[PDB]
Swiss-Prot record:
Subunit structure, interactors included: Monomer. Interacts with DnaB. The primase-helicase complex is composed of up to three DnaG bound to one DnaB hexamer. Component of the replication restart primosome, which is composed of PriA, PriB, PriC, DnaB, DnaC, DnaG and DnaT.
Highest taxon above the source species: Bacteria
Designated name of the protein: DNA primase
Biological function: RNA polymerase that catalyzes the synthesis of short RNA molecules used as primers for DNA polymerase during DNA replication.
GO cellular component: cytoplasm; DNA-directed RNA polymerase complex; DnaB-DnaG complex; primosome complex; replisome
Molecular function terms from GO: DNA binding; DNA-directed RNA polymerase activity; zinc ion binding
The record's note on its domains: Contains an N-terminal zinc-binding domain, a central core domain that contains the primase activity, and a C-terminal DnaB-binding domain.
GO biological process terms held by the UniProt record: DNA replication, synthesis of primer; replication fork processing
Source organism per UniProt: Escherichia coli (strain K12)
Complete-protein stretch covered: 445 to 580 of 581
Assigned keywords, A-Z: DNA replication, DNA-binding, DNA-directed RNA polymerase, Magnesium, Metal-binding, Nucleotidyltransferase, Primosome, Transcription, Transferase, Zinc, Zinc-finger
Homology family: Belongs to the DnaG primase family.
Amino acid sequence: QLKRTTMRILIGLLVQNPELATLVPPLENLDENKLPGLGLFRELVNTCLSQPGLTTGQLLEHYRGTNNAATLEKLSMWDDIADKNIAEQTFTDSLNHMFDSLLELRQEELIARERTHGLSNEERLELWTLNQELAKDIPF
Ligand SMILES: [Zn+2]
Ligand SMILES: [Zn+2]
């Protein structure tokens, strides 16, 4: 009866449909500490890209023995996301929500940085840009 969250959907859908990994943009320069589940998601995407065509069982086997194995097992049997017809649309929708979340975190970071240290011209333009566009047992 797992409740839906952005990272649960992304990781769950990827485990159940590893071919979805090809839809993910490069995540190399993201800070996994800013978003629970992001580090795991990025690991899974890299595994899938390393072995095109791998099945769900082959993906889960690669992660046997890791500290996330039990969580991926649960997401692999999570039938709330099991529908194949809407899987891809749900994946790309949730991808955008994840990056939306990172935008909101960055805006909050720049606001805090502005009070404590002030902003550079580049950072102040970034904050202005964010303000305009943002106005318009599983641990994640
Ligand atoms: Zn590996
Ligand atoms: Zn949406």
